[PDB]
Write an enzyme that holds these catalytic residues in place. Structure first.
Site, short mmCIF file in Angstrom:
data_model
loop_
_atom_site.label_atom_id
_atom_site.label_comp_id
_atom_site.label_asym_id
_atom_site.label_seq_id
_atom_site.Cartn_x
_atom_site.Cartn_y
_atom_site.Cartn_z
N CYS A 1 0.81 -1.23 0.00
CA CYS A 1 0.00 0.00 0.00
C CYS A 1 0.84 1.27 0.00
O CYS A 1 1.61 1.53 0.94
CB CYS A 1 -0.93 0.04 1.22
SG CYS A 1 -1.95 1.55 1.31
N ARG B 1 -0.03 4.54 2.95
CA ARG B 1 0.05 4.33 4.40
C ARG B 1 0.37 5.54 5.29
O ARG B 1 0.28 5.44 6.51
CB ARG B 1 1.01 3.17 4.73
CG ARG B 1 0.47 1.78 4.37
CD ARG B 1 1.52 0.73 4.69
NE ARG B 1 2.53 0.62 3.64
CZ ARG B 1 3.69 -0.01 3.78
NH1 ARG B 1 4.00 -0.57 4.94
NH2 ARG B 1 4.54 -0.08 2.75
N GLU C 1 -4.75 3.98 -10.75
CA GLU C 1 -5.50 2.76 -10.50
C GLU C 1 -6.64 2.66 -11.50
O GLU C 1 -6.97 1.57 -11.96
CB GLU C 1 -6.07 2.76 -9.08
CG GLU C 1 -5.05 2.63 -7.97
CD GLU C 1 -5.74 2.52 -6.61
OE1 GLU C 1 -6.17 1.39 -6.28
OE2 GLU C 1 -5.88 3.56 -5.90
C1 HEM Z 1 -6.32 6.52 2.03
C2 HEM Z 1 -5.95 6.44 0.75
C3 HEM Z 1 -5.30 5.16 0.16
C4 HEM Z 1 -4.57 5.15 -0.96
C5 HEM Z 1 -4.21 6.38 -1.82
C6 HEM Z 1 -4.14 3.79 -1.20
C7 HEM Z 1 -3.35 3.37 -2.25
C8 HEM Z 1 -3.19 2.05 -2.60
C9 HEM Z 1 -2.82 1.57 -3.92
C10 HEM Z 1 -2.57 2.44 -5.18
C11 HEM Z 1 -2.74 0.24 -3.85
C12 HEM Z 1 -2.41 -0.71 -5.00
C13 HEM Z 1 -3.80 -1.23 -5.39
C14 HEM Z 1 -3.71 -2.05 -6.66
O1 HEM Z 1 -2.82 -1.78 -7.53
O2 HEM Z 1 -4.54 -2.98 -6.79
C15 HEM Z 1 -3.06 -0.17 -2.49
C16 HEM Z 1 -3.06 -1.47 -2.02
C17 HEM Z 1 -3.42 -1.86 -0.75
N1 HEM Z 1 -3.91 -1.04 0.27
FE1 HEM Z 1 -3.97 1.06 0.20
N2 HEM Z 1 -4.63 2.98 -0.19
C18 HEM Z 1 -5.38 3.78 0.66
C19 HEM Z 1 -6.08 3.30 1.76
C20 HEM Z 1 -5.98 2.04 2.31
C21 HEM Z 1 -6.64 1.56 3.51
C22 HEM Z 1 -7.64 2.43 4.32
C23 HEM Z 1 -6.27 0.29 3.74
C24 HEM Z 1 -6.65 -0.68 4.89
C25 HEM Z 1 -7.05 -0.22 6.08
C26 HEM Z 1 -5.34 -0.08 2.70
C27 HEM Z 1 -4.70 -1.28 2.58
C28 HEM Z 1 -4.18 -1.79 1.41
C29 HEM Z 1 -3.86 -3.18 1.18
C30 HEM Z 1 -3.97 -4.38 2.15
C31 HEM Z 1 -3.34 -3.23 -0.26
C32 HEM Z 1 -2.87 -4.49 -1.01
C33 HEM Z 1 -4.05 -4.83 -1.93
C34 HEM Z 1 -3.89 -6.19 -2.55
O3 HEM Z 1 -2.94 -6.94 -2.16
O4 HEM Z 1 -4.74 -6.51 -3.44
N3 HEM Z 1 -5.19 1.00 1.86
N4 HEM Z 1 -3.32 0.96 -1.76
C1 LIG Z 2 -7.96 -9.72 -2.72
N1 LIG Z 2 -8.25 -9.47 -4.12
C2 LIG Z 2 -8.14 -10.54 -5.10
C3 LIG Z 2 -8.59 -8.18 -4.54
C4 LIG Z 2 -9.90 -7.69 -4.53
C5 LIG Z 2 -10.17 -6.39 -4.95
C6 LIG Z 2 -9.12 -5.58 -5.39
C7 LIG Z 2 -7.81 -6.08 -5.39
C8 LIG Z 2 -6.63 -5.26 -5.84
N2 LIG Z 2 -6.24 -4.40 -4.71
C9 LIG Z 2 -6.88 -3.12 -5.00
C10 LIG Z 2 -6.83 -2.10 -3.89
C11 LIG Z 2 -6.66 -2.38 -2.53
C12 LIG Z 2 -6.66 -1.35 -1.59
C13 LIG Z 2 -6.79 -0.03 -2.04
C14 LIG Z 2 -6.80 1.04 -1.16
C15 LIG Z 2 -6.95 2.32 -1.69
C16 LIG Z 2 -7.06 2.52 -3.05
N3 LIG Z 2 -7.19 3.75 -3.60
N4 LIG Z 2 -7.08 1.47 -3.86
C17 LIG Z 2 -6.95 0.23 -3.39
C18 LIG Z 2 -6.97 -0.79 -4.30
C19 LIG Z 2 -7.56 -7.37 -4.97
#
Ligand code: HEM
Ligand SMILES: CN(C)c1cccc(CNCc2ccc3ccc(N)nc3c2)c1
Ligand code: HEM
Ligand SMILES: CN(C)c1cccc(CNCc2ccc3ccc(N)nc3c2)c1
Ligand SMILES: C[C@H](O)[C@H](O)[C@H]1CNc2nc(N)[nH]c(=O)c2N1
Ligand SMILES: C[C@H](O)[C@H](O)[C@H]1CNc2nc(N)[nH]c(=O)c2N1
Ligand SMILES: [Zn+2]
Lengths: 409, 413
Positions: free
Chosen positions: B111, B114, B288
């Protein structure tokens, strides 16, 4: 322990078996991944198993494993290590080893070409003047009036570490970098240090933006010596834009031959500390990294102004806009001058095909996603969506320290 | 493992020192002989497995609030232990739940957002018993988080797993997504990523509008029961029509996207407890939508159509017509969101913030696990500061984890 890698766009799954033939470390552990670290952390007794390993795969590669020739070679290499603490590769082995070091280079997206490599044996070289002669021939051969040809020139292997052959330049052809009175930088800031070492040694700098550096060559552990590459051997391309007729006025140029000269080639336990090799450019190397990195030529702001972009906020993506036009210009210039170059779409597409060939015939292809994916437009190239496994196979190209950190004069 | 690992930034020459990796609790998938850093994805806990996992977390919590070794600390330990011993599980205090959720985000190596980790509205939905109740909780989440465009990060946490036959699950991968429909002729309508799920909704009784941007219904599973469909009130779903500040023809592409990214299919693990339903949301980074959702071949795949309207030479790949269209599309996405006052961050701002965040974390926490492959944006990588930043990746707990899709495991009643 078969391992699957999936492409998330094509859903193609490949199966890796080749990784089992690894003995060297990657740096990662079960709990920490160092996948984005740039540089993660002989003797007689060490030497024979490595030699035997390499001879074994060579004779296995030529489908004569356990043959009469094989057995004799093992015995021969064995006696030679025993009597001399080292040994000498046959010509066939040298060529095989150099091509396979390229083949095994996980960071290189150009490996579809791996078996087309002109190998120049320079293991009879004894002096820096000799090195200069060999390097000049390499440059002339590989440049080929614009139709570039992959080449490597191999100098004598390390002996005791006191008599190393080193090419002190990081590439055979690079532009000098000058620290200006106002603390700014003239030319290429990557080479500022090296440039000053050349100045200190007697080189008279023209103090320009694109001054071709001299060669600094060290033979047999001696002090390095300065040599000017004959300019007619240095092919350069004036960068212009096909739409923007103001682009040529930026005064940009680059050389056509990327020739990495500071790596170490390891084959069968032997170390080749001087092994300049060259192919041809992927456009982004110049267009994104050399030109647009903050710590290199750093031209985005200048270009952006000429395109009259709103630069007040990042969210106008003025940087991305300027970056694309620059890269268009580079490809256009090289193509218009009939100089070999590959765009990142074509290169990455060829790499996916290469990967497929390698899995099919070899059981895998070590690859470093961090290096393979181009530094712009990543996910619109197919490698972004390609899972890759990284692991270290030998023969290989290794990093070695800068010679000016270990050399006493 | 060495106690001090150094990461370098190759642009600024700044060197940071990580000690936090020593607290790493689970496997990356790498070994010393192979790196799996680009692999996407590399019945319940027994009493004895649960004891150290819980103590680990409680110690961490009481260390965070500067009450380590306190009477309240030891009392909480003893109470938790008794609870595990007599019930084979335990319940988190509201304070611990909030801490754990914030830390799972803080720990999320993939992420880039963060910097915002400590500002997260946590909704405790552990009293939920039915799918209707889940629906109510989710509508309240959406409205609060959307906030008329001024998005606020939030997570809603449903009851933890017990025996594994009573899981709460959101079947949707995100709370708001668009339907995909496979045509008889092999073409897809809507979002090809959601075809499978769309099919399931249709089998469950959904009547599909069969358009390009049909918001999917919620498919909600409570207490291990068969899942139920619910339509999200459309007035709760904020959407942005995409236009371009220069190209007037861009609005004619009929593109739009939804404002709230709300991942709903991950598992939240805190102190060995498993929350299989924990929808969370932040706001979007432009790429995204502009790069992945819009420009992936397996997604909406609009590059060609845009390039045609831009009248680009699309015969030589070396014209970089794809690259040129990609930038315009991303400019339009950012312009449309900013114009409609819906929170969005560009990849330059986001990655720059993440660098400052990472440095602060190394300073105050001894590290910041990060997955470079995910952190570097899918366009213009090299011209964002993260590209040049060496990162160490490792898994700290509490964490968000992947879990199998529920239709693969559900025992239909
Ligand atoms: C507040 C603004 C936030 C922004 C700008 C942001 C940004 C991002 C981006 C660009 C990604 C990559 C997503 C992708 O390419 O599929 C990501 C992934 C992720 N984010 Fe954040 N995020 C935010 C909030 C959060 C919050 C609130 C949480 C959890 C409490 C979180 C937890 C995660 C997790 C666990 C991933 C990995 C997703 C995966 O493995 O599919 N994010 N985030
Ligand atoms: C777990 N899985 C297969 C899954 C499901 C839905 C989306 C995704 C790809 N992760 C996208 C993601 C996660 C967290 C975010 C937080 C903020 C933001 N702007 N975008 C996010 C996108 C994987
Ligand atoms: C023929 C055309 C070739 C192309 C298009 C090509 C492309 C590339 C590119 C783009 C990189 C990344 C470099 C960077 O970003 O700094 C790279 C790395 C590398 N290439 Fe190739 N290459 C070619 C030929 C060769 C040859 C002939 C060899 C050796 C005989 C070779 C060995 C390597 C090695 C060892 C690296 C890693 C460099 C490092 O770790 O610093 N390449 N290649
Ligand atoms: C320190 N070191 C090994 C070094 C020196 C100069 C440059 C680099 C970065 N690698 C650049 C490189 C290497 C091989 C190439 C082969 C072909 C090609 N087109 N470009 C290459 C670029 C590291
Ligand atoms: C920190 C990171 O490892 C470093 O910036 C890498 C990233 N990927 C790269 N990829 C290529 N091809 N060349 C590079 O120099 C780098 N630099
Ligand atoms: C093969 C590779 O791991 C895969 O395509 C990854 C690359 N990096 C990513 N990075 C982000 N932020 N999101 C992604 O979906 C992916 N996909
Ligand atoms: Zn790894």
């Amino acid at each position: 322990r078969f391992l699957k890698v999936k492409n998330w766009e094509t859903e193609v799954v490949l199966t890796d078996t080749l990784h089992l033939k690894s003995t060297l470390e990657t740096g990662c552990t079960e709990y920490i991944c160092m996948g984005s670290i740039m540089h993660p952390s002989a003797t007689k007794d060490q030497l024979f198993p490595l030699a035997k390993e390499f001879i074994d795969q060579y004779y296995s590669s030529i489908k004569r494993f356990g043959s009469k020739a094989h057995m004799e070679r093992l015995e021969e290499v064995n006696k030679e290590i025993d009597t001399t603490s080292t040994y000498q590769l046959k010509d066939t082995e040298l060529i095989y080893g150099a091509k396979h070091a390229w083949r095994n280079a996980s960071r290189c997206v150009g490996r579809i070409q791996w078996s087309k490599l002109q190998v120049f044996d320079a293991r009879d070289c004894t002096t820096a003047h000799g090195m200069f002669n060999y390097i000049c021939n390499h440059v002339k051969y590989a440049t080929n009036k614009g139709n570039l040809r992959s080449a490597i020139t191999i100098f004598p292997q390390r002996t005791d570490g006191k008599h190393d052959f080193r090419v002190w330049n990081s590439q055979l052809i690079r532009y000098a970098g000058y620290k200006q009175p106002d603390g700014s930088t003239l030319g290429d800031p990557a080479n500022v240090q090296f440039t000053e070492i050349c100045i200190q040694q007697g080189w008279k700098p023209p103090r320009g933006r694109f001054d071709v550096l001299p060669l600094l060559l060290q033979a047999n552990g001696n002090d390095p010596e300065l040599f000017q590459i004959p300019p007619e051997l240095v092919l350069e391309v004036p960068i212009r834009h096909p739409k923007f007729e103001w682009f040529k006025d930026l005064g940009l140029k680059w050389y056509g031959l990327p020739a990495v000269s500071n790596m170490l080639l390891e084959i069968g336990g032997l170390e080749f500390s001087a092994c300049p090799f060259s192919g041809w450019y992927m456009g982004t190397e110049i267009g994104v990294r050399d030109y647009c990195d903050n710590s290199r030529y750093n031209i985005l702001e200048e270009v952006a102004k000429k395109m009259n972009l709103d630069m007040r906020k990042t969210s106008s993506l003025w940087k991305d806009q300027a970056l694309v036009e620059i890269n268009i210009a580079v490809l256009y210039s090289f193509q218009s001058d009939k100089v070999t170059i590959v765009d990142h779409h074509s290169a990455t597409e060829s790499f996916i095909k290469h990967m497929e060939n390698e899995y099919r015939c070899r059981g895998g292809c070590p690859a470093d996603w961090v290096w393979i994916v181009p530094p712009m437009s990543g996910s619109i190239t197919p490698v972004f969506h390609q899972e890759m496994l990284n692991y270290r196979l030998t023969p290989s190209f290794e990093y070695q320290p800068d010679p000016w950190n270990t050399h006493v004069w």
